[PDB]
Protein backbone atom coordinates (compact mmCIF):
# COMPACT_ATOMS: atom_id res chain seq x y z
CA UNK A 1 0.00 0.00 0.00
CA UNK A 2 1.65 3.18 -1.23
CA UNK A 3 1.13 6.21 0.97
CA UNK A 4 2.94 9.35 -0.19
CA UNK A 5 2.32 12.85 1.19
CA UNK A 6 -1.22 12.45 -0.20
CA UNK A 7 -4.49 12.74 1.70
CA UNK A 8 -6.08 9.59 3.16
CA UNK A 9 -9.74 10.57 3.51
CA UNK A 10 -11.21 9.49 6.84
CA UNK A 11 -14.64 11.14 6.73
CA UNK A 12 -16.06 14.14 4.90
CA UNK A 13 -14.61 16.29 7.67
CA UNK A 14 -11.08 17.30 6.56
CA UNK A 15 -10.77 20.58 4.64
CA UNK A 16 -8.03 19.97 2.09
CA UNK A 17 -6.48 22.32 -0.46
CA UNK A 18 -5.80 21.64 -4.13
CA UNK A 19 -2.15 20.80 -3.54
CA UNK A 20 -2.46 18.13 -0.84
CA UNK A 21 -5.29 16.44 -2.76
CA UNK A 22 -3.02 15.26 -5.56
CA UNK A 23 -0.59 12.37 -5.25
CA UNK A 24 2.86 12.53 -6.91
CA UNK A 25 1.78 10.21 -9.71
CA UNK A 26 -0.19 13.22 -11.01
CA UNK A 27 2.67 15.74 -11.17
CA UNK A 28 3.16 15.84 -14.92
CA UNK A 29 -0.59 15.36 -15.28
CA UNK A 30 -2.65 17.45 -12.82
CA UNK A 31 -0.28 19.54 -10.67
CA UNK A 32 2.55 22.07 -10.75
CA UNK A 33 6.08 22.21 -9.33
CA UNK A 34 6.51 24.36 -6.23
CA UNK A 35 9.92 25.71 -7.16
CA UNK A 36 11.15 26.10 -10.72
CA UNK A 37 14.81 26.50 -11.67
CA UNK A 38 17.16 25.47 -14.47
CA UNK A 39 19.38 23.54 -12.03
CA UNK A 40 17.78 20.22 -12.99
CA UNK A 41 18.22 20.69 -16.74
CA UNK A 42 21.39 19.46 -18.46
CA UNK A 43 23.81 20.88 -18.78
CA UNK A 44 23.82 23.03 -15.67
CA UNK A 45 26.01 23.39 -12.61
CA UNK A 46 25.12 24.45 -9.04
CA UNK A 47 22.30 22.02 -8.28
CA UNK A 48 22.61 20.88 -4.64
CA UNK A 49 23.16 24.50 -3.62
CA UNK A 50 19.83 25.38 -5.27
CA UNK A 51 18.11 22.56 -3.38
CA UNK A 52 19.52 23.45 0.06
CA UNK A 53 18.58 27.09 -0.60
CA UNK A 54 14.98 26.09 -1.38
CA UNK A 55 14.62 23.74 1.60
CA UNK A 56 16.11 26.17 4.13
CA UNK A 57 14.12 29.02 2.58
CA UNK A 58 10.76 27.25 2.90
CA UNK A 59 11.38 25.96 6.44
CA UNK A 60 12.57 29.44 7.51
CA UNK A 61 9.63 31.26 5.91
CA UNK A 62 7.23 28.89 7.60
CA UNK A 63 8.78 28.79 11.08
CA UNK A 64 9.16 32.55 11.19
CA UNK A 65 5.58 33.46 10.27
CA UNK A 66 3.45 31.59 12.81
CA UNK A 67 0.47 30.18 10.95
CA UNK A 68 0.69 32.96 8.36
CA UNK A 69 1.05 30.60 5.39
CA UNK A 70 -2.13 29.06 4.05
CA UNK A 71 -0.04 26.88 1.73
CA UNK A 72 3.63 26.31 0.92
CA UNK A 73 5.75 28.84 -0.92
CA UNK A 74 6.17 29.59 -4.61
CA UNK A 75 9.89 30.12 -5.25
CA UNK A 76 10.16 31.11 -8.87
CA UNK A 77 13.78 31.65 -9.76
CA UNK A 78 15.37 33.70 -12.55
CA UNK A 79 19.08 34.39 -12.16
CA UNK A 80 19.18 37.26 -9.70
CA UNK A 81 15.49 36.78 -8.82
CA UNK A 82 14.21 34.85 -5.79
CA UNK A 83 10.58 35.86 -6.20
CA UNK A 84 8.21 35.11 -3.29
CA UNK A 85 4.45 34.85 -3.84
CA UNK A 86 2.68 33.11 -0.96
CA UNK A 87 -0.89 32.94 0.36
CA UNK A 88 -1.46 34.33 3.86
CA UNK A 89 -4.41 34.24 6.23
CA UNK A 90 -6.44 37.44 6.64
CA UNK A 91 -5.94 37.52 10.41
CA UNK A 92 -3.30 40.06 11.41
CA UNK A 93 -2.55 43.70 10.73
CA UNK A 94 -1.08 44.72 7.36
CA UNK A 95 1.31 47.02 9.24
CA UNK A 96 2.86 43.93 10.84
CA UNK A 97 2.80 42.17 7.47
CA UNK A 98 4.80 44.95 5.82
CA UNK A 99 7.19 44.88 8.78
CA UNK A 100 7.75 41.16 8.17
CA UNK A 101 7.93 41.52 4.36
CA UNK A 102 10.72 44.07 4.70
CA UNK A 103 12.30 41.81 7.33
CA UNK A 104 12.42 38.83 4.97
CA UNK A 105 13.56 41.08 2.09
CA UNK A 106 16.53 42.30 4.09
CA UNK A 107 17.49 38.98 5.71
CA UNK A 108 17.23 36.84 2.57
CA UNK A 109 18.75 39.48 0.30
CA UNK A 110 21.76 39.80 2.59
CA UNK A 111 22.09 36.10 3.37
CA UNK A 112 21.86 34.59 -0.12
CA UNK A 113 23.30 37.76 -1.73
CA UNK A 114 20.48 38.36 -4.20
CA UNK A 115 17.71 40.88 -5.00
CA UNK A 116 14.43 39.62 -3.54
CA UNK A 117 11.03 41.24 -3.90
CA UNK A 118 8.22 39.70 -1.90
CA UNK A 119 4.63 39.40 -3.08
CA UNK A 120 1.61 38.21 -1.13
CA UNK A 121 -1.91 37.11 -2.10
CA UNK A 122 -4.03 37.28 1.05
CA UNK A 123 -6.72 34.64 1.55
CA UNK A 124 -9.47 35.00 4.22
CA UNK A 125 -9.08 31.44 5.51
CA UNK A 126 -7.43 28.15 4.77
CA UNK A 127 -8.11 27.64 1.08
CA UNK A 128 -10.19 24.52 0.50
CA UNK A 129 -10.62 22.36 -2.59
CA UNK A 130 -12.01 19.20 -1.05
CA UNK A 131 -13.64 17.95 2.12
CA UNK A 132 -11.58 14.83 1.77
CA UNK B 1 -0.75 75.40 -10.78
CA UNK B 2 0.00 74.05 -14.26
CA UNK B 3 3.68 74.96 -13.76
CA UNK B 4 4.04 73.03 -10.49
CA UNK B 5 1.95 70.16 -11.93
CA UNK B 6 4.11 69.76 -15.03
CA UNK B 7 7.20 70.09 -12.86
CA UNK B 8 5.73 67.61 -10.33
CA UNK B 9 6.77 64.17 -11.61
CA UNK B 10 7.05 64.14 -15.43
CA UNK B 11 10.12 66.24 -16.23
CA UNK B 12 12.00 66.20 -12.93
CA UNK B 13 10.37 64.61 -9.89
CA UNK B 14 12.37 66.51 -7.29
CA UNK B 15 9.32 68.80 -7.02
CA UNK B 16 7.07 66.24 -5.35
CA UNK B 17 7.62 65.78 -1.60
CA UNK B 18 10.31 66.00 1.02
CA UNK B 19 7.84 65.40 3.85
CA UNK B 20 4.53 63.58 3.77
CA UNK B 21 2.99 67.01 4.43
CA UNK B 22 4.47 68.36 1.17
CA UNK B 23 2.60 65.77 -0.91
CA UNK B 24 -0.55 66.19 1.20
CA UNK B 25 -0.54 70.00 0.95
CA UNK B 26 0.24 70.16 -2.78
CA UNK B 27 -2.36 67.51 -3.65
CA UNK B 28 -4.97 69.11 -1.38
CA UNK B 29 -4.49 72.62 -2.77
CA UNK B 30 -4.46 71.54 -6.43
CA UNK B 31 -7.45 69.22 -5.87
CA UNK B 32 -9.51 71.92 -4.12
CA UNK B 33 -8.68 74.39 -6.91
CA UNK B 34 -9.50 71.85 -9.64
CA UNK B 35 -12.73 70.92 -7.86
CA UNK B 36 -14.13 74.36 -6.99
CA UNK B 37 -12.69 76.20 -10.02
CA UNK B 38 -12.80 73.74 -12.93
CA UNK B 39 -15.56 71.63 -14.43
CA UNK B 40 -16.64 68.05 -13.75
CA UNK B 41 -14.09 66.36 -16.04
CA UNK B 42 -11.12 67.82 -14.16
CA UNK B 43 -12.80 67.03 -10.83
CA UNK B 44 -13.20 63.39 -11.92
CA UNK B 45 -9.53 63.54 -12.94
CA UNK B 46 -8.75 64.84 -9.44
CA UNK B 47 -10.73 61.94 -7.94
CA UNK B 48 -8.66 59.59 -10.10
CA UNK B 49 -5.27 61.31 -9.92
CA UNK B 50 -4.72 63.09 -6.61
CA UNK B 51 -7.06 61.57 -4.02
CA UNK B 52 -6.56 58.13 -5.63
CA UNK B 53 -2.92 58.82 -6.52
CA UNK B 54 -2.16 59.83 -2.94
CA UNK B 55 -4.22 58.50 -0.04
CA UNK B 56 -7.73 59.71 0.99
CA UNK B 57 -8.86 63.34 1.40
CA UNK B 58 -8.74 65.68 4.39
CA UNK B 59 -11.80 67.02 6.20
CA UNK B 60 -11.96 70.37 4.41
CA UNK B 61 -10.81 68.51 1.29
CA UNK B 62 -13.83 66.22 1.62
CA UNK B 63 -16.05 69.26 2.18
CA UNK B 64 -14.66 70.85 -1.00
CA UNK B 65 -15.21 67.57 -2.84
CA UNK B 66 -18.80 67.41 -1.56
CA UNK B 67 -19.49 71.04 -2.49
CA UNK B 68 -17.95 70.59 -5.95
CA UNK B 69 -19.99 67.43 -6.45
CA UNK B 70 -23.13 69.31 -5.36
CA UNK B 71 -22.29 71.93 -7.99
CA UNK B 72 -22.20 69.18 -10.64
CA UNK B 73 -24.97 67.02 -9.02
CA UNK B 74 -23.00 63.90 -8.06
CA UNK B 75 -24.04 62.52 -4.67
CA UNK B 76 -23.62 58.85 -5.66
CA UNK B 77 -20.02 58.14 -4.60
CA UNK B 78 -20.33 60.21 -1.43
CA UNK B 79 -20.36 57.07 0.77
CA UNK B 80 -17.05 55.62 -0.50
CA UNK B 81 -15.28 58.94 0.09
CA UNK B 82 -17.12 59.14 3.43
CA UNK B 83 -15.65 55.78 4.45
CA UNK B 84 -12.29 57.09 3.20
CA UNK B 85 -12.64 60.16 5.44
CA UNK B 86 -13.79 58.20 8.50
Amino acid sequence: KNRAARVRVSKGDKPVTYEEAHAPHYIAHRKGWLSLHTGNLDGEDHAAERTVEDVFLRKFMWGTFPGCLADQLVLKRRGNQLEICAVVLRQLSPHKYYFLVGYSETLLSYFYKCPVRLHLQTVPSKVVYKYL
Amino acid sequence: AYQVHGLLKTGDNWKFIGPDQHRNFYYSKFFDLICLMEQIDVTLKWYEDLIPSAYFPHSQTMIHLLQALDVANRLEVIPKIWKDSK
Partner: protein, 120 residues
Protein backbone atom coordinates in the same frame (compact mmCIF):
# COMPACT_ATOMS: atom_id res chain seq x y z
CA UNK C 1 34.22 67.06 2.79
CA UNK C 2 31.49 66.23 5.31
CA UNK C 3 29.15 69.09 4.36
CA UNK C 4 29.46 67.85 0.76
CA UNK C 5 28.17 64.40 1.77
CA UNK C 6 25.39 66.12 3.73
CA UNK C 7 24.75 68.05 0.51
CA UNK C 8 24.46 64.71 -1.31
CA UNK C 9 21.96 63.56 1.30
CA UNK C 10 20.12 66.81 0.59
CA UNK C 11 20.28 65.71 -3.07
CA UNK C 12 18.72 62.38 -2.12
CA UNK C 13 15.93 63.92 -0.03
CA UNK C 14 15.02 66.36 -2.79
CA UNK C 15 15.37 63.77 -5.60
CA UNK C 16 13.40 61.04 -3.82
CA UNK C 17 10.65 59.70 -6.09
CA UNK C 18 8.10 56.88 -5.80
CA UNK C 19 7.84 53.85 -8.03
CA UNK C 20 4.93 53.35 -10.43
CA UNK C 21 5.55 50.07 -12.30
CA UNK C 22 7.66 46.93 -12.39
CA UNK C 23 9.82 48.71 -14.96
CA UNK C 24 10.57 51.19 -12.15
CA UNK C 25 11.27 48.36 -9.71
CA UNK C 26 13.79 47.28 -12.29
CA UNK C 27 14.94 50.94 -12.55
CA UNK C 28 15.87 50.83 -8.85
CA UNK C 29 17.23 47.27 -9.18
CA UNK C 30 19.36 48.21 -12.21
CA UNK C 31 20.84 51.44 -10.90
CA UNK C 32 21.56 49.78 -7.53
CA UNK C 33 24.12 47.58 -9.30
CA UNK C 34 22.21 44.47 -8.28
CA UNK C 35 21.25 42.45 -11.36
CA UNK C 36 23.58 41.26 -14.10
CA UNK C 37 25.04 43.53 -16.77
CA UNK C 38 22.75 42.67 -19.65
CA UNK C 39 23.35 41.20 -22.22
CA UNK C 40 25.08 38.52 -20.18
CA UNK C 41 28.62 37.30 -20.62
CA UNK C 42 30.50 35.06 -18.17
CA UNK C 43 34.01 36.59 -18.19
CA UNK C 44 32.77 39.67 -16.27
CA UNK C 45 35.06 40.48 -13.33
CA UNK C 46 36.71 37.02 -13.37
CA UNK C 47 39.44 37.90 -15.81
CA UNK C 48 42.69 36.08 -14.74
CA UNK C 49 44.16 39.57 -14.00
CA UNK C 50 44.60 40.74 -17.59
CA UNK C 51 47.21 38.20 -18.68
CA UNK C 52 47.96 37.80 -22.35
CA UNK C 53 47.73 34.52 -24.20
CA UNK C 54 51.54 34.41 -24.50
CA UNK C 55 51.81 34.63 -20.70
CA UNK C 56 49.89 31.33 -20.68
CA UNK C 57 51.56 29.58 -23.62
CA UNK C 58 55.22 30.63 -23.68
CA UNK C 59 56.47 29.73 -20.21
CA UNK C 60 60.19 29.65 -21.12
CA UNK C 61 60.53 32.89 -19.11
CA UNK C 62 60.27 30.98 -15.80
CA UNK C 63 62.86 28.25 -16.43
CA UNK C 64 66.26 29.86 -15.79
CA UNK C 65 68.08 27.67 -13.22
CA UNK C 66 67.58 24.39 -15.08
CA UNK C 67 69.80 22.31 -17.43
CA UNK C 68 69.45 22.01 -21.20
CA UNK C 69 69.57 18.44 -22.60
CA UNK C 70 68.98 15.51 -20.27
CA UNK C 71 66.45 13.75 -18.05
CA UNK C 72 65.56 16.50 -15.60
CA UNK C 73 65.08 19.20 -18.24
CA UNK C 74 62.74 16.73 -19.91
CA UNK C 75 60.87 16.48 -16.60
CA UNK C 76 60.68 20.28 -16.43
CA UNK C 77 59.34 20.42 -20.01
CA UNK C 78 56.64 17.97 -18.94
CA UNK C 79 55.54 20.01 -15.93
CA UNK C 80 55.81 23.24 -17.98
CA UNK C 81 53.56 21.86 -20.71
CA UNK C 82 51.30 20.43 -18.02
CA UNK C 83 50.77 23.88 -16.52
CA UNK C 84 50.45 25.15 -20.11
CA UNK C 85 47.20 23.32 -20.83
CA UNK C 86 45.62 23.98 -17.40
CA UNK C 87 43.03 26.81 -17.49
CA UNK C 88 41.90 26.20 -13.90
CA UNK C 89 44.99 27.91 -12.46
CA UNK C 90 46.25 31.48 -12.68
CA UNK C 91 49.71 32.20 -14.05
CA UNK C 92 50.89 33.35 -10.59
CA UNK C 93 49.96 29.97 -9.09
CA UNK C 94 51.77 28.23 -11.96
CA UNK C 95 54.99 30.13 -11.26
CA UNK C 96 54.48 29.25 -7.58
CA UNK C 97 54.53 25.55 -8.42
CA UNK C 98 57.51 26.22 -10.75
CA UNK C 99 59.53 27.80 -7.93
CA UNK C 100 58.55 24.97 -5.60
CA UNK C 101 60.00 22.50 -8.13
CA UNK C 102 63.18 24.58 -8.42
CA UNK C 103 63.54 24.91 -4.63
CA UNK C 104 62.94 21.19 -4.11
CA UNK C 105 65.18 20.02 -6.93
CA UNK C 106 68.10 22.06 -5.69
CA UNK C 107 67.25 21.35 -2.04
CA UNK C 108 68.01 17.62 -2.16
CA UNK C 109 71.21 17.79 -4.19
CA UNK C 110 72.72 14.72 -2.50
CA UNK C 111 70.89 12.04 -4.50
CA UNK C 112 70.72 14.35 -7.54
CA UNK C 113 74.52 14.42 -7.55
CA UNK C 114 74.41 10.68 -6.88
CA UNK C 115 72.33 10.47 -10.09
CA UNK C 116 75.52 10.55 -12.25
CA UNK C 117 74.19 13.63 -14.12
CA UNK C 118 74.46 17.30 -13.16
CA UNK C 119 71.33 19.30 -12.42
CA UNK C 120 71.69 23.08 -12.60
Amino acid sequence: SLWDVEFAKQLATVNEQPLQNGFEELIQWTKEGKLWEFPINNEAGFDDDGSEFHEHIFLEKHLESFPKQGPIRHFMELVTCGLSKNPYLSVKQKVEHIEWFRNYFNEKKDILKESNIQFN
